[PDB]
């Protein structure tokens, strides 16, 4: 980890073990061994940071095989692994829309963290530490998000306003503030089949889904790119259509009941702020 969070824990240690060299009996110590690899690990995702999407299955399959090959110094330890192990399987359980899965693990990275952020603050954070936090809160609004319609069927306006309290952004509010300020007809998250997970303010628009399923079949392609924002006029319906793809299986799509251009900015740009806090990618580049 050419960061810092991870070098100055690698440059303690770098003095430290100058130290026992006083007395022995644990010399034999796979730690140095285990921090080798879990930074190599890092190196790897901060790598990944560029590619459009990130396929977490395969990183939380890769993180349980170094872990398993070693079962203060160790309680540390135990907790950063442990975290980012469970954050890397919550996020691609959301990946999957998977509702009651990915509430378990995300509520074990959040629990252990608060409870690490707790017993810190009381005896006095590394930017590692604070990723991991800045990748929790992501992942928490991301969930908020993608099952808010479950989450508000589920529980009490009370338990709803608890959640939504540490939901950092509140995407799900933003949404409505837009709906509101521009009459849009309706806003929704499509899962891909092609259901509406999340539709703003009413249910599903049945009568645009004929337009709105058309629309992604043919722009698929600039859809996956995931960084562009499709725009589509029906004047046989006087209707305007905004989509964007922040990940491969999440369609976002704004309709208008009446034209609107493909060149009204802050369409597209309140379209590319939802986008972009939903991105895996973007936030294991601020690794670094």
Wanted: one cysteine or more; aromatic letters at 12%; hydrophobic letters at 40%.
């Amino acid at each position: 980890x050419x960061x810092x969070x991870x070098x100055x824990x690698x440059x303690x240690x770098x003095x430290x073990x100058x130290x026992x060299x006083p007395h022995l009996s644990e010399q034999l110590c796979f730690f140095v061994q285990a921090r080798m690899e879990i930074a190599d690990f890092y190196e790897k995702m901060y790598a990944l940071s560029t590619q459009k999407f990130i396929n977490t299955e395969e990183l939380v399959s890769t993180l349980d095989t170094i872990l398993r090959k070693y079962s203060p110094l160790e309680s540390s330890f135990q907790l950063e692994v442990g975290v980012l192990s469970h954050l890397l399987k919550a996020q691609a359980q959301i990946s999957e829309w998977k509702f009651l899965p990915s509430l378990v693990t995300l509520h074990n990275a959040h629990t252990k963290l608060q409870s690490w952020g707790q017993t810190f603050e009381k005896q006095r954070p590394p930017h590692l530490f604070l990723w991991l936090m800045k990748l929790k809160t992501m992942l928490l609004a991301k969930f908020s998000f993608y099952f808010h319609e479950a989450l508000s069927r589920q529980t009490t306006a009370s338990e709803m306003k608890a959640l939504t309290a540490k939901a950092n952004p509140d995407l799900f509010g933003k949404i409505s503030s837009f709906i509101r300020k521009y009459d849009a007809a309706n806003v929704s998250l499509i899962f891909d089949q092609y259901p509406a997970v999340v539709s703003l303010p009413s249910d599903r628009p049945v009568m645009h889904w004929p337009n709105v399923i058309m629309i992604m079949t043919d722009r698929a392609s600039d859809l996956n790119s995931l960084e562009k924002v499709v725009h589509f006029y029906d004047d046989k319906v006087q209707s305007t259509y905004f989509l964007t793809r922040p990940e491969p299986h999440f369609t976002i799509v704004v309709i208008f009941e009446s034209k609107k251009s493909e060149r009204d900015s802050h369409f597209i740009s309140f379209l590319n702020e939802l986008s972009l806090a939903l991105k895996n990618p973007k936030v294991f580049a601020s690794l670094k």
